[PDB]
């Protein structure tokens, strides 16, 4: 189990590292590396975290040559998991970054939430279609993904509006909330993600 966590991206990435490290405590051969650059070989599980604007997201990937690296990971059916801004970067384009193209790894786009209180900050409830445990996770975001139902993994409702709080396309997974800040239920999710990538 070689785990990568992309460490270029904006905002804090170390909490994700620290929680992924926590979640992996009971697993055999856990290596967790901060990925700043493309490597010779591919991980079994690759995290794209992020807090900040969509454009910074893509640029810190692009500046550091991680687009093809993240891409070659999908080409070899390796687990790729977007967290917060990472989930959004998984899509094609975003209102937050008018000219800026996403990884476009999952079909759809990103759109501002509809509420008068943006960002959607605090504990909100996630309901999944399977695998991952339903309950309250901690969120902070102004924007939301727009995809087909076959890709929706987890649902959330904030001021009347229902949006994907989690998404999935084969081995590509996206989460909108911060597992690393969602207490026990957050480890649990993170353990499960690891458990998915132990399989192939």
């Amino acid at each position: 189990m070689r785990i990568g966590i992309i460490s270029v991206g904006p905002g804090n990435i170390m909490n994700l590292y620290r929680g992924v490290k926590r979640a992996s405590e009971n697993f055999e051969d856990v290596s967790i590396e901060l990925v700043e650059s493309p490597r010779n070989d591919l991980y079994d599980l690759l995290f794209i975290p992020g807090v900040g604007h969509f454009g910074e997201g893509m640029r810190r990937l692009r500046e550091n040559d991680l687009i093809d690296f993240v891409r070659k990971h999908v080409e070899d059916e390796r687990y790729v998991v977007g967290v917060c801004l990472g989930m959004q970067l998984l899509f094609e384009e975003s209102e937050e970054a008018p000219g800026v193209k996403g990884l476009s790894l999952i079909e759809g786009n990103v759109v501002k939430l509809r509420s008068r209180r943006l960002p959607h900050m605090g504990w909100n409830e996630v309901i999944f279609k399977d695998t991952f445990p339903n309950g309250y996770y901690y969120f902070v975001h102004t924007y939301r993904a727009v995809c087909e139902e076959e890709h929706v993994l987890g649902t959330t409702e904030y001021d009347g509006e229902i949006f994907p709080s989690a998404v999935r396309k084969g081995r590509i997974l996206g989460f909108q909330f911060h597992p690393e800040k969602s207490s026990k239920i957050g480890r649990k999710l993170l353990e499960k993600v690891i458990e998915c990538s132990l399989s192939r």
């Binding site: 900050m121 504990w123 309250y136 800040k181 969602s182």
Partner: protein
Amino acid sequence: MLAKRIIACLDVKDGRVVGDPVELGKFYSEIGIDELVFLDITASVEKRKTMLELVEKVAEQIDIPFTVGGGIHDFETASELILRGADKVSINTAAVENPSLITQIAQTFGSQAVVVAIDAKRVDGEFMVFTYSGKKNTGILLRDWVVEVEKRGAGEILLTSIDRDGTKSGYDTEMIRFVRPLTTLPIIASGGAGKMEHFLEAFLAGADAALAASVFHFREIDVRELKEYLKKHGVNVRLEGL
């Protein structure tokens, strides 16, 4: 749906709760507190690097958001503490004296990262803003300060009613209502909580979160029992399960 937040506040000094702050906060996370807030009273000469190891230690082991404050007087200070691993800082005096500090924090680390602490008091029939640990009347109207705070970029208001603090008389729900329609910022009530009922009230007045100190530490209210209670009175809260 979005949960009403139950927030716990610890006073720190020399990296110690005036237990081990990492210890207690980890325990608060396991019993179901929604957020931690550390208000720091270390001397003047030591504060800087002490506040840094605190954040450094907490951030190594806590799995929920945490706010740091006490004497955060400039952007540099705010910046080192966030880059160190704090989810947000709270600013009060330095916020009032220099409101662009709020935008400098919001624009650099996001609005999420700035909790502005407001301490109002009823003077001559008006809600007036005080600074210097509740010791100076700035002569600034709460109403005026609340709108500016939003407009400058802050993510949240921690709203403290000076006179209610320590009384056990309940939250200042009149203050909450006055503030409620004036801003779209989540609101945290502080000072006055004595019994589970008081939380309901503050939540009904339109507070987005409720903060307490001793009563949590010293155990008059139970976090678990407080939430189920709140749950029984139509307040949507986060509730583990087992």
